[PDB]
Design a protein around this nucleic acid. Structure first.
Ligand SMILES: [Mg+2]
Lengths: 419, 474
DNA sequence: ATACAACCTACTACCTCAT
DNA sequence: TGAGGTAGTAGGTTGTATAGT
């Protein structure tokens, strides 16, 4: 007995259409034999074809594209239907599927030039209607439609190649956990020594004005050159709040709540950063929000660090990987590093108008893929590191903030086959 | 070394209860959730606007392919995809002429120029809609470039085209078009002449100013899917959503106009399992905050919104939802939520969820060019988690976010629930955007349309429009 | 008068649509 | 796809209380 609807086709030129035809047909109730569905591995791969077109193939559908009539594999596939065209002795056994808007008569193979046109050109639907309405006038066999079969195929077959696979994969953050915090945070009732009018961001240590007390991780003795007549401050007088408590929430003063205290660490951290980069070998890109740090041309050998290329070239403009420091306390206190792309037409003189910088940043980004953005960042943070396991930020002489130079790794079972 | 769990990709259901993961593929395979009687399409553009709009209707009957049809599925052809005809023969045109365009467009003010073309089209639309015995399923505003070019704030028509000096010394034309048509419910799909005929809009060089050969079928996907939805039926539903959930997306928009800089229009959009959506329009209050850079609500208006949502839910679904998630991008103040609390039935669970796209936890896959695939998540606490609605997708073999993807901080700010369900649901909600037909959006639809919505609330403020489905607000 | 409060404004990384 | 528009977020610029004449 014979039931199928063998589809003959050019791959990959007509794949879009054959996959649509077969699957719309299979869900409509037909049995469709199509190379698309299998993953053959035999010497009978062709004989499979032949066996199927020979015996069980009710209808030969051939994609009537330019590529399909010129394709050695489809011409060989076609060879049998004509051979079996006589055996069945039914005129409509072969159906050219005219999907190509641009078929010259000359391309079309003679056998199928003769036959009637299943017009997929004007609309894919009308012809689906025509192919089936043709399947009504001659009684080609059908099952009651189960589109469930349709996409059992699609979901198992087509999507076989690429889906979520139970795989293991780790991913590196851009969060860089703080390692060590100053044993206390102290607050200086600076009083006459403090001048409110003065700016402390040239005070070479992270300092800010909170109420009438003075906030920093620098011990009172630390500001000397720019802050005279302060040997007058009792060492005792100043609140010495336990930092190992503040993260916990153990500290809640009704005078100032921890939420106040957590916010306060950050400006310092980011300042401790901003000062550290004053003296750590990178020219700074200024965005209004905070600064970005891009190494200048030639500072690393051939503009590479640790095999990575952190300065390169685009068009007539060099590019230089830059980074930023957000520090966030929660969940775990970390330094965040967002990556950037600064730009210079020459080694070390920064481009003037960001409109060019925006267009360049977009243009150059297209180049960098997940592998690339990661290495450069990691290396940049590897770059800055002032020892084996972390960065130093200098809140003060005896007090330092140490950030891990390698970011939290996340390990997730479930990943995808890379194409 | 923390560990990521993974969220199975939510399944959206199409014709014959068959659900898969890509609307583009689900519609193509089976078609829409509720097949519809053919779209009658009405046009409100230049005589040229028709031929272009006819160009597309003829164009999208035939298949149109993307650059690479894996990362972007091809568009088989309207009739093949949706199993119904969106015919170009069957057009119901309300003309506009350059004389009308020139006369109203050239005003010195943008706003008096804007507001008036908008009133032009509406009369052209409303006259056709109200007066017509014949019936049009969607009104398609086919915008000549000259309109899109000049009808926004900050676009300066030269002082050498203005015929009338300004009478005295919002303004986005399309959003306003939707907002003024808001009181009388009519589906407005707005198209640009450049987009539908983008190869007939060459630049000085002779190449087209904007070149869409890479994505031309994707366009047909976005427009017909939106076209389809406006014309009535929804393309799909969430495949496996537990019964009786209520998704409430909190929207506000500061009204800059007021002297007191707290007037901020408010709304809530209600998503169930469809995404057809219901936009509950709240009225104008002091929601913006100076100190907190935040949006919030007084109880009494807040109770009205919850109840407006709950009651319209019960009228729709004959019960009160056993679970109601309210999404917004801000945390909730305990008073505003206790306002919700009271309105709520005793056994319904109310969940507040803050979806903040801060810039945290950019996760770089260790090996390979592609980023973490979407559905990976990081659970900080039983309450707050990191969700990747963006990043590599296998059925697309593309990253959704074209750079390294940013996950979204998800905190059950108020109420209690299972964060895993939250993540799930929210991953589910990205799938419901009928208008931009893609695999999934970056945002769940609850909050996806706020900013666009934010305009339409403030744009029309006199009205007191009933709760409305999305197609009106789109 | 200023000692401070709370805005508002660029600038940038993303993300969307007159898609 | 991409030229766009939007949304974070800092601040310096700015608009309001205090405080003393
Ligand atoms: Mg869209």
């Amino acid at each position: 007995m014979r039931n199928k609807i063998f589809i003959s086709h050019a791959t990959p030129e007509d794949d879009d259409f054959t996959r649509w035809l077969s699957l719309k047909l299979i869900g409509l109730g037909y049995e469709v034999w199509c190379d698309i569905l299998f993953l053959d591995k035999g010497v009978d791969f062709w004989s499979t074809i032949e066996k199927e077109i020979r015996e069980n193939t009710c209808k030969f559908l051939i994609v009537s594209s330019t590529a399909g009539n010129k394709r050695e594999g489809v011409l060989k596939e076609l060879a049998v239907a004509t051979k079996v065209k006589k055996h069945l002795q039914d005129d409509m056994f072969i159906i050219p599927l005219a999907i190509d808007e641009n078929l010259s008569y000359d391309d079309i193979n003679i056998e199928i030039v003769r036959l009637n046109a299943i017009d997929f050109k004007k609309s894919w639907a009308k012809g689906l209607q025509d192919l089936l309405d043709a399947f009504e006038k001659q009684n080609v066999p059908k099952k009651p439609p189960d589109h469930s079969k349709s996409n059992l195929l699609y979901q198992q077959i087509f999507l076989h190649d690429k889906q979520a696979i139970e795989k293991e994969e780790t991913y590196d953050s851009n969060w860089f956990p703080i390692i060590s915090f100053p044993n206390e945070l102290r607050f200086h009732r600076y009083d006459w020594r403090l001048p409110k009018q003065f700016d402390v961001r040239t005070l070479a240590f992270p300092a800010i004005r909170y109420k009438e007390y003075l906030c920093t991780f620098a011990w009172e003795y630390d500001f000397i050159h720019q802050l005279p007549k302060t040997e007058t401050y009792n060492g005792q007088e100043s609140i010495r709040i336990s930092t190992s408590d503040i993260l916990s929430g153990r500290y809640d003063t009704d005078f100032i709540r921890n939420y106040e205290c957590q916010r306060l660490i950050v400006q310092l951290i980011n300042k401790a950063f901003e000062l550290r980069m004053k003296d750590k070998n990178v020219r700074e890109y200024q965005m209004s929000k905070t600064f970005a740090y891009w190494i200048e041309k030639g500072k690393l050998e051939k503009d590479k660090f640790e095999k990575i290329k952190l300065v390169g070239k685009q068009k007539n403009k060099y590019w230089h990987f830059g980074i930023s420091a957000a520090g966030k306390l929660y969940p775990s206190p970390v330094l965040m590093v967002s990556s950037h792309i600064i730009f210079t037409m020459d080694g070390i003189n920064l481009i003037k108008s960001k409109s060019i910088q925006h267009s360049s940043r977009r243009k150059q980004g297209k180049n960098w893929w997940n592998d690339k953005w990661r290495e450069k960042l990691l290396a940049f943070i590897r770059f800055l590191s002032d020892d084996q396991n972390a960065i130093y930020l200098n809140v003060g002489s005896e007090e330092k903030i140490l950030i891990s130079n390698k970011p939290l790794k996340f390990f997730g079972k479930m990943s995808y086959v890379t194409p | 070394m923390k560990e990521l769990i993974y969220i199975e990709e939510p399944s959206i259901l199409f014709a014959h209860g068959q659900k898969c993961t890509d609307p583009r593929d689900g519609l193509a395979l089976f078609g829409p959730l509720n097949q519809i009687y053919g779209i009658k399409s009405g046009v409100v553009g230049t005589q040229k606007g028709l031929q272009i709009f006819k160009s597309y209707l003829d164009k999208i009957q035939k298949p149109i392919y993307n650059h690479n049809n894996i990362t972007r599925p091809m568009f088989p052809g309207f009739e093949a995809v949706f199993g119904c005809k969106w015919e170009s023969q069957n057009i119901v045109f309300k003309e506009i002429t350059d004389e009308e365009i020139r006369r109203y467009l050239f005003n010195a003010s943008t706003h008096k120029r804007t507001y008036d073309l908008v009133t032009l089209f509406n009369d052209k639309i409303i006259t056709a809609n109200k007066n017509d015995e014949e019936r049009v399923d969607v009104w398609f505003v086919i915008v000549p470039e000259e309109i899109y070019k000049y009808c926004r704030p900050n676009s300066v028509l030269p002082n050498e085209l203005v015929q009338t000096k300004s009478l005295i010394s919002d303004a986005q034309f399309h959003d306003q078009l939707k907002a003024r048509l808001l009181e009388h419910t009519i589906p407005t799909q707005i198209l640009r002449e450049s987009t539908l005929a983008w190869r007939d809009f060459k630049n000085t060089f002779g190449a087209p100013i904007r070149d869409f050969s890479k994505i031309e079928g994707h366009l047909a996907w976005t427009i017909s899917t939106a076209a389809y939805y406006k014309a009535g039926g929804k393309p799909w539903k969430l495949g496996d959503i537990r019964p009786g959930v209520c998704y409430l997306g909190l929207v506000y928009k500061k009204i800059e106009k007021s002297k007191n800089p707290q007037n901020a229009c408010c709304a809530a959009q209600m998503f169930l399992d469809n995404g057809d959506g219901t936009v509950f329009k709240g009225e104008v209050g002091p929601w913006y905050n100076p100190e907190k850079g935040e949006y919030h609500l007084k109880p009494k208006e807040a109770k009205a919104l919850l109840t407006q949502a709950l009651e319209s839910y019960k009228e729709q679904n004959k019960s009160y939802p056993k679970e109601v998630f309210i999404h917004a991008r801000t945390r909730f103040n305990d008073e505003e939520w206790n306002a919700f609390n009271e309105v709520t039935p005793k056994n319904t669970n109310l969940v507040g969820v803050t979806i903040t796209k801060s810039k945290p936890l950019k996760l770089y896959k260790t090996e390979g060019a592609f980023p973490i695939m979407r559905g990976n998540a990081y659970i900080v606490d039983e309450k707050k988690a990191f969700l990747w609605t963006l990043g590599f997708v296998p059925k697309l073999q593309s990253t959704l976010s074209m750079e390294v993807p940013n996950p979204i901080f998800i905190e059950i700010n108020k109420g209690e629930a299972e964060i895993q369900q939250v993540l799930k649901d929210i991953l589910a909600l990205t799938k419901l955007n009928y208008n931009a037909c893609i695999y999934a959006d970056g945002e769940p639809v609850t909050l996806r349309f706020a900013n666009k919505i934010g305009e339409i609330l403030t744009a029309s403020t006199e009205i007191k429009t009933p709760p409305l489905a999305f197609k009106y607000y789109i």
